[PDB]
Amino acid sequence: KKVCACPKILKPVCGSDGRTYANSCIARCNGVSIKSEGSCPTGI
Numbered sequence: 357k358k359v360c361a362c363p364k365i366l367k368p369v370c371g372s373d374g375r376t377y378a379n380s381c382i383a384r385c386n387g388v389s390i391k392s393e394g395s396c397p398t399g400i
Contacts, residue, residue: 372389375388
């Protein structure tokens, strides 16, 4: 099984699954799309 290696960049974003990613590249490798900006909350 292959997997993407997350880069060393900062200012993460929120995918359309409702989870945090270091960039759009990572959400895409999980089958998610970018939705909003910043680190996403746990749901609180």
